[PDB]
């Protein structure tokens, strides 16, 4: 169980670690976060109180080295750092844990969320979707465009997601027009698991952590990304049937975890009426569809 | 983004486009069988592909034999024309390709679009106009070639004949509009207006008979009273 302690909490700010939340007092003597599951990614993220603009934070894995934040009065937030000197984040870490100035990451026992939201989710493939080499940790906030969006500014602040166009000539194939832009099994299947993601874990691990930044930063590019994925694999003909069954569990957990307050902005309408509908694979969602319909009615 | 009223006149600049419409590639007559059953016999079709400004139509005709053993044709027959329009534009000389192209039913964008993302640069385009071209098959020369036509064909018209030694493109478009609108609302009348005089011929390579300035007033006279009668015969006015 690893801990991600804080110099000080000098700016009133609401934490959140992975899908749990809690508010900390301007000046308060909050020293950070205990007890974190190791073998998961987790994110540590941040709301200012004073100025609710900006969601932001930072994904990291605990295994990969010892990290801290520390509030910088110049750039106006928390920042994630890494520790190189193992024998002094012991010592000041075992200090706040005999004070008891840490939460404690307040996992359930019977709760595998975490762990359904994040099942393909690596620090390695974040660190090439959010290029900042020099930190083991990568930062994300509600204003980061998509390498798409900035085809459609700055390119080393960027998500670096995955390029999907459905009217792409990588998406048809020259003389099968109209049979890729109906089915695109070819392109999901070909160009883009073959291709480009190589096996379906490292695809969903990538539909995962981009439906995470749209939920908890509220990062458009990221829901669009989310949406696009889920669309090519229901606007698939073939797929795999090992696929169809885990990509029903992970969107159940996702609309599961969503806030009911944010399903109008988080929930494409027209995406989701196709796919549980009208798609190849409106009858192989059978979870997603049950929660979809008796949580969100509405949206369809 | 769309061709409506407030951007008429951009019909008759000097870009070069093309009107596309699928409203006749795929045309059935529906009949009873043996068993008392519903049936279709598809009959030849096709696309109707205008540049407003010349008056070149690219009459492409959509033989029967492509619809054999397809299913869906309705969807087909939309990715069928864009496919026909694709291989149009690759087989003009560059200076004769479109730089947009207006398709006349919105769900030919997506089926157009795809078959040309080679060409980026040509725009594809809807048009909020309510454009007649359905009545293409009513001019009987284009007709008579369609139903004849025993394999795929394309055939080459000037649908203004030699209006423009005398007009503008805007006034020959407005014309054609007027005919068509005229055949589609009462093809019986609309074809006794243009053809119950005999001492005014069609010549052998025209479409519509040869009229002096002063007749086509009248003539066009003729189709507005026309199609504003059957607009009261329709709506009782
Ligand atoms: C004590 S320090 O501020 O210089 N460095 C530090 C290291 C680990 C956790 C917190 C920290 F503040």
Same mark, same amino acid.
């Given at each position: 169980?690893?801990?991600?302690?804080?110099?000080?909490?000098?700016?009133?700010?609401?934490?959140?670690?992975?899908?749990?939340?809690?508010?900390?007092?301007?000046?308060?003597?909050?020293?950070?976060?205990?007890?974190?599951?190791?073998?998961?990614?987790?994110?540590?993220?941040?709301?200012?109180? $004073?100025?609710?603009?900006?969601?932001?934070?930072?994904?990291?894995?605990?295994?990969?080295?010892?990290?801290?934040?520390?509030?910088?009065?110049?750039?106006?937030?928390?920042?994630?750092?890494?520790?190189?000197?193992?024998?002094?984040?012991?010592?000041?870490?075992?200090?706040?844990?005999?004070?008891?100035?840490?939460?404690?990451?307040?996992?359930?026992?019977?709760?595998?969320? %975490?762990?359904?939201?994040?099942?393909?989710?690596?620090?390695?493939?974040?660190?090439?979707?959010? #290029?900042?080499?020099?930190?083991?940790?990568?930062?994300?906030?509600?204003?980061?465009?998509?390498?798409?969006?900035?085809?459609?500014?700055?390119?080393?602040?960027?998500?670096?997601?995955?390029?999907?166009?459905?009217?792409? #000539?990588?998406?048809? #194939?020259?003389?099968?027009?109209?049979?890729?832009?109906?089915?695109?099994?070819?392109?999901?299947?070909?160009?883009?698991?073959?291709?480009?993601?190589?096996?379906?874990?490292?695809?969903?691990?990538?539909?995962?952590?981009?439906?995470?930044?749209?939920?908890?930063?509220?990062?458009?590019?990221?829901?669009?990304? %989310?949406?696009?994925?889920?669309?090519?694999?229901?606007?698939?003909?073939?797929?795999?049937?090992?696929?169809?069954?885990?990509?029903?569990?992970?969107?159940?957990?996702?609309?599961?975890?969503?806030?009911?307050?944010?399903? $109008?902005?988080?929930?494409?309408?027209?995406? %989701?009426?196709?796919?549980?509908?009208?798609?190849?694979?409106?009858?192989?969602?059978?979870?997603?569809?049950?929660?979809?319909?008796?949580?969100?009615?509405?949206?369809? | 983004?769309?061709?409506?009223?407030?951007?008429?006149?951009?019909?008759?600049?000097?870009?070069?486009?093309?009107?596309?419409?699928?409203?006749?590639?795929?045309?059935?007559?529906?009949?009873?069988?043996?068993?008392?059953?519903?049936?279709?016999?598809?009959?030849?079709?096709?696309?109707?592909?205008?540049?407003?400004?010349?008056?070149?139509? *690219?009459?492409?005709?959509?033989?029967?034999?492509?619809?054999?053993?397809?299913?869906?044709?309705?969807?087909?027959?939309?990715?069928?024309?864009?496919?026909?329009?694709?291989?149009?534009?690759?087989?003009?000389?560059?200076?004769?390709?479109?730089?947009?192209?207006?398709?006349?039913?919105?769900?030919?964008?997506?089926?157009?679009?795809?078959?040309?993302?080679?060409?980026?640069?040509?725009?594809?385009?809807?048009?909020?106009?309510?454009?007649?071209?359905?009545?293409?098959?009513?001019?009987?020369?284009?007709?008579?070639?369609?139903?004849?036509?025993?394999?795929?064909?394309?055939?080459?018209?000037?649908?203004?004949?030699?209006?423009?030694?005398?007009?503008?493109?805007?006034?020959? *478009?407005?014309?054609?509009?007027?005919?068509?609108?005229?055949?589609?609302?009462?093809?019986?009348?609309?074809?006794?207006?243009?053809?119950?005089?005999?001492?005014?011929?069609?010549?052998?390579?025209?479409?519509?008979?040869?009229?002096?300035?002063?007749?086509?007033?009248?003539?066009?006279?003729?189709?507005?009273?026309?199609?504003?009668?059957?607009?009261?015969?329709?709506?009782?006015?």
């Amino acid at each position: 169980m690893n801990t991600v302690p804080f110099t000080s909490a000098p700016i009133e700010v609401t934490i959140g670690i992975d899908q749990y939340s809690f508010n900390v007092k301007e000046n308060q003597p909050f020293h950070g976060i205990k007890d974190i599951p190791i073998g998961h990614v987790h994110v540590i993220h941040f709301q200012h109180a $004073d100025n609710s603009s900006m969601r932001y934070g930072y994904w990291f894995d605990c295994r990969m080295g010892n990290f801290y934040i520390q509030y910088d009065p110049k750039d106006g937030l928390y920042k994630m750092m890494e520790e190189r000197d193992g024998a002094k984040f012991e010592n000041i870490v075992h200090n706040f844990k005999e004070r008891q100035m840490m939460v404690s990451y307040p996992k359930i026992d019977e709760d595998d969320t %975490w762990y359904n939201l994040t099942e393909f989710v690596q620090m390695d493939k974040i660190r090439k979707i959010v #290029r900042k080499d020099e930190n083991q940790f990568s930062y994300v906030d509600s204003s980061m465009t998509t390498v798409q969006e900035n085809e459609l500014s700055d390119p080393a602040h960027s998500l670096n997601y995955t390029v999907i166009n459905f009217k792409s #000539r990588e998406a048809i #194939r020259p003389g099968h027009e109209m049979e890729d832009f109906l089915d695109k099994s070819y392109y999901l299947n070909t160009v883009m698991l073959q291709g480009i993601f190589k096996n379906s874990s490292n695809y969903f691990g990538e539909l995962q952590f981009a439906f995470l930044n749209a939920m908890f930063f509220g990062n458009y590019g990221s829901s669009l990304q %989310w949406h696009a994925m889920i669309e090519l694999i229901c606007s698939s003909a073939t797929v795999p049937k090992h696929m169809l069954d885990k990509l029903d569990e992970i969107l159940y957990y996702q609309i599961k975890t969503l806030p009911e307050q944010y399903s $109008d902005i988080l929930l494409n309408e027209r995406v %989701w009426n196709i796919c549980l509908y009208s798609s190849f694979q409106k009858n192989s969602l059978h979870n997603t569809e049950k929660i979809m319909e008796n949580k969100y009615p509405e949206l369809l | 983004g769309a061709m409506n009223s407030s951007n008429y006149a951009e019909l008759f600049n000097n870009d070069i486009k093309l009107f596309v419409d699928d409203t006749n590639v795929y045309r059935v007559t529906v009949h009873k069988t043996f068993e008392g059953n519903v049936a279709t016999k598809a009959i030849n079709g096709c696309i109707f592909t205008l540049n407003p400004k010349t008056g070149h139509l *690219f009459l492409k005709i959509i033989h029967t034999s492509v619809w054999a053993g397809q299913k869906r044709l309705s969807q087909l027959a939309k990715w069928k024309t864009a496919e026909e329009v694709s291989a149009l534009v690759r087989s003009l000389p560059k200076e004769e390709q479109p730089k947009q192209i207006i398709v006349t039913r919105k769900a030919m964008l997506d089926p157009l679009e795809v078959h040309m993302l080679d060409f980026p640069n040509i725009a594809i385009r809807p048009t909020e106009l309510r454009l007649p071209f359905s009545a293409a098959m009513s001019i009987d020369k284009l007709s008579d070639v369609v139903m004849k036509a025993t394999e795929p064909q394309m055939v080459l018209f000037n649908i203004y004949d030699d209006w423009l030694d005398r007009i503008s493109s805007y006034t020959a *478009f407005s014309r054609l509009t007027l005919l068509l609108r005229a055949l589609k609302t009462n093809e019986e009348s609309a074809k006794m207006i243009l053809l119950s005089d005999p001492t005014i011929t069609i010549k052998s390579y025209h479409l519509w008979p040869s009229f002096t300035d002063e007749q086509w007033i009248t003539i066009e006279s003729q189709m507005r009273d026309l199609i504003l009668t059957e607009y009261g015969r329709k709506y009782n006015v």
